[PDB]
Structure 1
Amino acid sequence: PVAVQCGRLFDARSGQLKGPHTLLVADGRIRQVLPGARVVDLGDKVCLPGWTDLHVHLGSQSSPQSYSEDFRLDPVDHAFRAVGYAEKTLMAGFTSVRDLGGEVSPHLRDAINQGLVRGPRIFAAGKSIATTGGHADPTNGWNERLAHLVGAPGPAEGVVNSVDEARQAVRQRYKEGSDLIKITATGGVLSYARSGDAPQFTVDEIKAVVDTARDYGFRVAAHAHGTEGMKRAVQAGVTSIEHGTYMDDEVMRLMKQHGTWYVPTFYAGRFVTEKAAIDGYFPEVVRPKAARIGALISQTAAKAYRNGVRIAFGTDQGVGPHGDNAREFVYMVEAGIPAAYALQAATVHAAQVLGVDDQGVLEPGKRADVIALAGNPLEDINAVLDVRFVMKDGVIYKQ
């Protein structure tokens, strides 16, 4: 039971910044909010709800040695790195994340929930579902010998080629403690494959995935660059679309009429655009796709925002360095999106994307996830780069 006196409070529901306020917190919930036991004085700081990043990969981080780790490193090394990654993510002001791929994240979520390590609240997708040769196929680029001693990946490994295999893959993800489902509808940039945006799912397979996920209470996120795969994913009924690179007017209309959420991920596009100029950083098959696809996200996201498509906050950290997520906010404001909507997309719209109602706004009966900033972010957007106070579930982690 504590009382946090905030000099200025940001309302995520209305998007407006209020004046001095007091928050009485008990049992990890916001017990009461008073306009105008232990006292926490942040009377010269701007208070906000904890941020949510809807696209992270806490089990990896890009480096020049990435494309060999799968042959040299064990999951235990990735877990030891993920401890520091999760600590840096929590200290940057993000009290919740959605992990969109990786088999160490559910274990890390269990460890954080038990109290062994510090970090955010993780909504884990587990292994991403793909087709043969797809963006998430775990055998792309392997020679004949390794592929022969591995075998052709199947539904247990996340690779499907029919409706029944898609059903089995969704059920296998449920068996392993996943919180949601992730599919790759088209090709990608960082995969060891020729194509970058070709459609890799049929409408029947995506419909089977969505129908199976509805039975287990799972939401489906879709990775899509090309227009045809994005259209198939939207018409099948996925909840969110990732990177939306080649989105057009018909896809925009379908998104608006369906209510699908859009996650642009400015940070990943800028990172892959900058890192493709360095010789030898990416493999020769990856570099042209990175150079071509990275420099379109800002334009596509600005066009989608101007047309009324619902946009939510997500960065794809795992390509960029963990702990620098808030820079995305800056990229959102220099692309023509107002700062208030940018903060709403990380606080109140992120909860709608996640399908929960116990977080997002500083209201009674909700989780006590509170952060504070030195400066007011509605005038200068760089103020989000200096987080002073972090509290999660009523426990103070930075003060």
Structure 2
Amino acid sequence: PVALHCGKLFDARSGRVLGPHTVVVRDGRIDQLISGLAAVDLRNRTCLPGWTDLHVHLGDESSPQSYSEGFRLDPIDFAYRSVGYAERTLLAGFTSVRDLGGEVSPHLRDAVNQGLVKGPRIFAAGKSIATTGGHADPTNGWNDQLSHLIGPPGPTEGVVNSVDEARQAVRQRYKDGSDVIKITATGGVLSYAKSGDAPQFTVDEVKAIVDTANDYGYKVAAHAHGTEGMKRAILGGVTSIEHGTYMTDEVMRLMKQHGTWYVPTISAGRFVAEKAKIDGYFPEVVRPKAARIGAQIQDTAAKAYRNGVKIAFGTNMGVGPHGDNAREFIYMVEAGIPAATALQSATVLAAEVLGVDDQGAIETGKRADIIAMPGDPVADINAVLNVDFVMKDGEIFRQ
């Protein structure tokens, strides 16, 4: 039981910064909210709900050696790095995240929930689902010896080529303890493959995946760069799109008609564009794709916001360094999105995307996830980089 005394409170639902309030926390939930027991002196700060990042990869981080480490290291080696990744993410103000790829994240989520290590609340997708040769194919770029030794991937490994295989892949993700489903509708930038935006799913396969996920209470997030794959994913019935780099007017119209969410991930685009200029950082099959695709993300976000598409917060922090997720707010504001809208996209709209109703706002009965900063983020978005108070489930991790 603790009472927090804030000088200003950000109303996520209304998008307005109110005056002094007092928040009483008991049993890990907000019990009372008074306008006007242990106590924490925050009267010179602005209190906001904890942020949610809807696209992270906590099991990895980009580096010059990332394309040769997979053949020499084991996942146990990556867990010890994920410890620090998760701690740095939590201490920056993000009390929950949506992990969208990797087999290390479910274990990290279990460890964090058991109290073994520090971190945010993790909604883990597990192994991503692709087609043969797709962006998430685990054996892209292997030589003949290794490929023959391991054999062709199947639904158990996340590679599907028919309706029944998609059904089995979703059921296998459920069997391994996932919270959400991720598919790669088109090609990617960082994969050891040739194409970057070609359609790699059919409409029927997407429909089968979505129906199976509906049976099991899951949501589906689709990775898409090109127009045709994005169109097929939208028609299939996915919940959100991740890298709509080549969104057109027709795609935006379909998104508005169907209510699909859009998660830009501007930070990853900027990072890959910057790293493409360095010689030898990327493999020769990856550099042209990164150079071409990383320079068309901010414009797409600005156009989508202007056209009325629903936008949510996500950074793809497995590409950039973990713990610097808060610069996506600055990028979004510089892209034309108002500061209040950008802050809402990470608190309440993020909770809508996740499908939960016990977080996202400072209201009675909700989880006590509260953060604070000295400045006013609405007046100046640059204040999001100085977070000095973090609370998650009623436990204070930073003061």
Task: Work out whether the TM-score is over 0.5.
Answer: yes
For the pair 1:346 / 2:349, whether they are aligned, the reply is no
Measured after TM superposition, the shift of residue 6 of structure 1 is 0.5
Tell me the residue number matched to 1:282.
282
Counterpart of 1:321? 321
Greater shift in the superposed pair: 376-385 or 112-121: 376-385
How far apart in 2 are the matches of 1:144 and 1:77? 26
Structure 1: which amino acid aligns with 2:103?
E
Match of 1:108? 108
How many angstroms apart in 2 are the aligned matches of 1:179 and 1:378? 33
Letter of the 1:131 partner, please give it.
T
Unaligned runs of 5+ in 1: none
The equivalent of 2:6 in structure 1 is: 6
Q: Secondary structure at the match of 1:186?
A: coil
Q: SS in structure 2 opposite 1:130?
A: coil
Task: Tell me the CA shift for residue 397 of structure 1.
Answer: 0.3
Shift of 1:290: 0.2
Measure, in 2, the Cα distance between the counterparts of 1:374 and 1:134.
46
Give runs of aligned pairs for residues 62-211 of structure 1, distance below 5 A.
Answer: 62-211=62-211
Q: Check if 1:237 corresponds to 2:237.
A: yes
Distance 1:379 1:266 in 2: 22
Q: Shift in Å at residue 41 of structure 1?
A: 1.1
Amino acid at match of 1:333: V
CA distance in 1, matches of 2:152, 2:13: 49
1:249 is aligned with what amino acid?
A: D
- Listed as ranges, the gaps of 5+ residues in structure 2 are none
Deviation for aligned residue 1:379? 1.7
The amino acid across from 1:69 in the alignment is E
**SS in structure 1 opposite 2:346?**
helix
Distance (Å, rounded) in 2 between the aligned partners of 1:115 and 1:134 = 37
* Structure 2 residue aligned with 1:375: 375
Q: Distance in 1 between matches of 2:46 and 2:127?
A: 38
Residue 220 of structure 1 pairs with residue 220 of structure 2: yes
Aligned pair count reads 399
Q: Deviations over 1:62-107 (max 9, x none)?
A: 0000001110110111000000000000000000000000001000
SS in structure 2 of the partner of residue 230 of structure 1: helix
2:21 maps to 1:40: no
Which letter does structure 2 place at the counterpart of 1:284?
Answer: E
- 2:394 counterpart of 1:394: yes
Residues 207-248 of structure 1 show CA distances to partners (whole Å, capped at 9, x for unaligned) of 000000000000000000000000000011100001111000
In the aligned structure 1, how far is the partner of 2:218 from the partner of 2:380? 38
Counterpart of 1:248 in structure 2 is 248
CA distance in 2, matches of 1:70, 1:132: 20
Shift of 1:382: 1.1
* 1:16 paired residue number: 16
Name the CA distance, whole Å, in 2 between partners of 1:115 and 1:155.
Answer: 33
SS at match of 1:23: strand
- C-alpha distance in 1 between matches for 2:333 and 2:304: 14
> After superposition, what is the alpha-carbon deviation per residue over 1:156-215, rounded to whole angstroms, capped at 9, x for unaligned?
000000000000000000000000100000000000000000000000000000000000
Which secondary structure state, in structure 2, belongs to the residue aligned with residue 66 of structure 1?
Answer: coil
Report the Cα distance in structure 2 between the residues aligned to 1:394 and 1:381, rounded to whole angstroms: 26
Distance 1:36 1:250 in 2: 50
Identity fraction in percent: 80
User: Aligned pair 1:264/2:276, yes or no?
Assistant: no
SS in 2 for 1:31: strand
Distance between the aligned counterparts of 1:243 and 1:183, measured in 2? 12
The C-alpha deviation readout for 1:129-161, integer Å capped at 9, x for no partner, is 000000000100111111000100000000000
One-letter amino acid matched to 2:28: G
Aligned-partner SS, 2:222? strand
TM-superposed CA distance for 1:287, in Å, is 0.2
- Paired AA for residue 129 in structure 1: I
Name the SS of the counterpart of 2:7 in structure 1. Answer: strand
Q: Provide the secondary structure at the position in 2 that maps to 1:200.
A: coil
Give the aligned residue type for 1:271.
F
* Residue 125 (structure 1) shift: 0.2
Q: 2:245 & 2:152 partners in 1: Cα distance?
A: 30
Distance in 1 between the 2:154 and 2:233 partners? 22
Shift of 1:37: 1.0
SS in 2 for 1:391: strand
Q: Secondary structure at the match of 2:18?
A: coil
1:376 is matched by which residue type in structure 2? D
Distance 1:291 1:187 in 2: 15
1:298 Cα deviation from its structure 2 partner? 0.3
SS in 1 for 2:347: helix
CA offset at residue 117 of structure 1?
0.3
The one-letter code matched in structure 2 to 1:74 is: D
CA distance in 1, matches of 2:270, 2:374: 27
